[PDB]
Structure formats: C-alpha cells, structure tokens
Design a binder for this molecule. Sequence first.
Ligand SMILES: [Cl-]
Ligand SMILES: [Cl-]
Ligand SMILES: [Zn+2]
Ligand SMILES: [Zn+2]
Lengths: 290, 290
Amino acid sequence: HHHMIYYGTMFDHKVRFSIVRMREVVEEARNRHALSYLATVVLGRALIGAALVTPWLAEKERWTLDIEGNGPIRRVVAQSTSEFTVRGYVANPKVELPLNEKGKFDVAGAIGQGVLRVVRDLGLKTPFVSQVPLVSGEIAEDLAYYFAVSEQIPSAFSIGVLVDSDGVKIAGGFAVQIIDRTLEQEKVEMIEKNIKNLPSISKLFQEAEPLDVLERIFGEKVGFVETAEIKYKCDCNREKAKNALLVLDKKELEDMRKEGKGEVVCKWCNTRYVFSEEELEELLKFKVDD
Amino acid sequence: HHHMIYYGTMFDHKVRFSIVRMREVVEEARNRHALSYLATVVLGRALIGAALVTPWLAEKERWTLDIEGNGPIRRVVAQSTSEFTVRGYVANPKVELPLNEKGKFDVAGAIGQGVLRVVRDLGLKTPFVSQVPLVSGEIAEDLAYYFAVSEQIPSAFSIGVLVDSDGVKIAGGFAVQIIDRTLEQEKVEMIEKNIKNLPSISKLFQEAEPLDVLERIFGEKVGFVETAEIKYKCDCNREKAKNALLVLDKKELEDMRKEGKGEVVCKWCNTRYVFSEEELEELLKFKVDD
Ligand SMILES: [Cl-]
Ligand SMILES: [Cl-]
Ligand SMILES: [Zn+2]
Ligand SMILES: [Zn+2]
C-alpha cells in the first residue's frame, strides 16, 4: 500500500509515532501540477510532513505547513486534515537547480532564506498560526524545530522522496515525538541514537517494512498500531469557482466577457474552471441586481 | 513612582508575578500621539501588557503585541524590551465611541473582531510569531489566552487605565503566571479565587500599594521582589529617517523635491523629520550614484 500511514505510542504513552508510505499521493501532486523533479521533492517532503501529523489533529482540523523563502521556489504549502487527506502547491512548479554537492536534489537551495508557518484551523473564528525561522530548509528538521519550540514536543522527522522519469518511486517518512517529557533520559538517548543511525528514507524504505523500521527506532517491536489511507483531496468545485469570480471587480469580469471566456484555476489541485460569455453576462447581471 | 515594575516568584518558583504602575509612560504615549481618551485606554492597556512581561524576556529581546481587528481603532501595537522600555501606537489615534453599557471606555468595540499576535525578536534571522483569535477584545484576557495556549503558561492579567481632562491618572496592572504546572491545585484555586475577588485596577490602585495587592493575591506576603523603571523609548533618529527616504522610489523623492520638502514621521513615537529641497537633491544625486 503506497498511500498508508501507521501510528501509535510507546513507553506508557510518553512517545507517539507516525510512519507513512505515500508515493501515490506525491505522484498525484506531481501530475496535477506538472511539477519538475525538484519541485516534486520539495512539495513531496512538505506533503509527507503534513501527512505524518494527521493522526494527532483535532476533529475537523485543517493543518497547514507554509514555508516561505527567497530561493527560486519561493513558497511551499502543504495541508492535511483529520480525515487523513492532503493537498498542496508551490509558487514555482517548474523550478530547476543543480544537484547539491552530495548529488541530492537541492531542497534547501530551492527554498532559500526564510520561515516556516503552521496554521491550525480548528473551527474557531480564525486559526492559530505559529511562525519560526527556518533551521536548514530541508523541511524535516525545520518541522521538528517548530514542534520543539512552538508546541514543546521534542521531535524527529525523517522524510524522503525518490523520483525519476517513470515518476515518484518513494515518498515516505516517519515522525517520533515526546509528548511527555518525564520520559526516562536513557529511552530519550536510545531513541535519538537509533534514529541517527538509520539510512535516509530513499534507502531505508527500499530495505525495510514500516513496522521493522519502527522496531529499529525503539530497540524492541512496537505494540498496538493503527493504520489509515492518506489521499490527495481538494474541496474545490464549480460553485466555488463561480463564487471566486463573483468577488472580482465588475471591470475584471467585463474584461473576461470581452475576452470571450473567464478561467479560475484552483491553486491546490490545479483544476481549471472555464466560464462562457453567457455565464459571465449572468454573473455581471447578478452584480448589478445585487 | 509612576513608571515602576515589581517582580518575583512564589511557591518554590512555580509561579511568577509582575505588577506595574506606569501612568507617566501612558501619559507620554498620549501626548506624543495626541491620543483621544478611548485610544489612550486601548493603547495604555496594551503598553501595560507589554511592560508586565519585561522581567521575563531574553537578553536583547524585543517583544511585540500586535492586536488587529475590524473595529474603528483597527490596530493596536505595543512593544517592550529587555531594557524595561516600551513604545507603541494605534492605527486610529482619534477614535471615539459611546461608552459601553457599564459606562466604561469601549475597548472591545474599538478593536472589534480580530486576532492577537506576539512577536518575539530574540536575535535570530527572523522572529518567533504566534497568532491567536481574540477572546474578548479587552486585552488582559486576550493576552492571558495567548500565554495559556501558545506558551503553555496559565496566566491572569489585570489591567486598567484611568484618564480625564488633566490626563492619565492610573495606568497599571498585574500578571500572575504558572510556570510549573505541578503546582498544588489548592494554591491554583486560592490564587484564582483571590484574583477574581479583586476590584478592577482603576479602583484597586487608588486603595492599595503594589505589595499589598500582591499579598491579597497570594494569601500571604510575597518574599523577594525586584524592581525596575519602565520608560517610553524609541530608537528612531534622523539617520534612520534619511535611510527611510532612500528606500523610496526616485519618483516619490522627486515629487517631494518639487513640493519643497519631505517628511518622515516615526509611527512609534510620532517624531517628525523634515528634509529640505537641497537634502532631497542630495539623496536623489545618491539614487543615481548608487
Ligand atoms: Cl513510498
Ligand atoms: Cl499608575
Ligand atoms: Zn482544487
Ligand atoms: Zn520614534
């Protein structure tokens, strides 16, 4: 299953864990947005990030990771939900760069100097937003820093996307978080050591099943694990596109009407919504009557 | 002393407290900005808020409260520093509204529906920022909720500003915060009860010295207490104003040059900086020379 998260807790519930295989989801993002190889990795990592926190979201929460910087990708946005769905986008889907010195996709260079935001939308009038400076721009470590500093949850994220000309081959990772800091220091140290010892996801996920990866982290096999299916999903529809156009100035709608057509593209899933001259005339007529 | 903070901890350092009398500081904000009565109270409360957290800032921190809403004041910004200074401003210094039903200044109405932000500028590349929805728009409680939710520091703030035609008469308040949540529930309960029982600041500060107010909160007299002087202070100067003009488009500087003069007004302290035609020529000469 290449769209599956596994999750649970260890050590009398003082540690929580998440591990995901989601090449299918990242492949869908790549195709919907026609992402370059580099943009696939950057956004993929962000999507994995969002996915990994899904088990821990409140009811009907939307959780958004919003990384913004001065590198040529400019912005990376990944949203997950309590329903185990994700969606996301980058400002520059066609970004290309030389590989880094170690021959990997230059995620850090794509993002450049900037910041990481987490938006928690939990059904109050406006969402909680927390912003921190980037640590490295590799996404994993940036997100672990957010958790340590804003949420006071010591964290390790490990995340990897492997993509070639036939598409995304691996897109997965894990998250280990200390939710109760009275956890014995030797359990802390051992977890730390075991993770630091693991190969990067691209290599680890070709060699080990998710549950065996976890056994390696915790020094013993895990106990109870829950699973869920991660899906790429957006809530856009045509009604919403039409409303998007109704908020525009009369002049914009006139200009489309003389152009012969109006188009709305959903930024999250790249779905295009095309409106005819008549449909625009209808919306304009509505603008005057309202 | 009407620009003074007192601070310490109680119960084996599990609770920290802050209490401030600062009419002089709030009076100066009112004169610099030519604040209306209502804008005096709104900004004053925010300045008190910022002042109350000064003892607990990191070294060289600037801590900024930024409340933004749809009421007629629009925005309220108060910054404090590790050097026990403050500065602040509102978007609409002349705002007026009817008194609320209880005959008080309508702080909540002035702010309206909106959000509270805290910016922690601690010498990293960009600051920590945390945003929460407003709870009531009275400021004290909104700030207490920021602390409970973003910093996980259960908190009580009580804040009051009394102003008439001779100016600010009282501008003070206190903060009590649980920095170690293992604190016995009966101390928690007693503190809560004692604070809830207090009169509002406008009344209490006419009747009780700061240390006696704290005795009332904690059920016994406090122990070791530190003091500091709170001062209104800004870091603007003319060199900075000249730089502010250098960042403007050539065209803006040309228009001022034909206008005969250029003005920069510091938003924090309402100091105005006036530049002659020759000085604008100088900067322009420097625009095409850079
Ligand atoms: Cl995978
Ligand atoms: Cl006072
Ligand atoms: Zn969509
Ligand atoms: Zn100034």
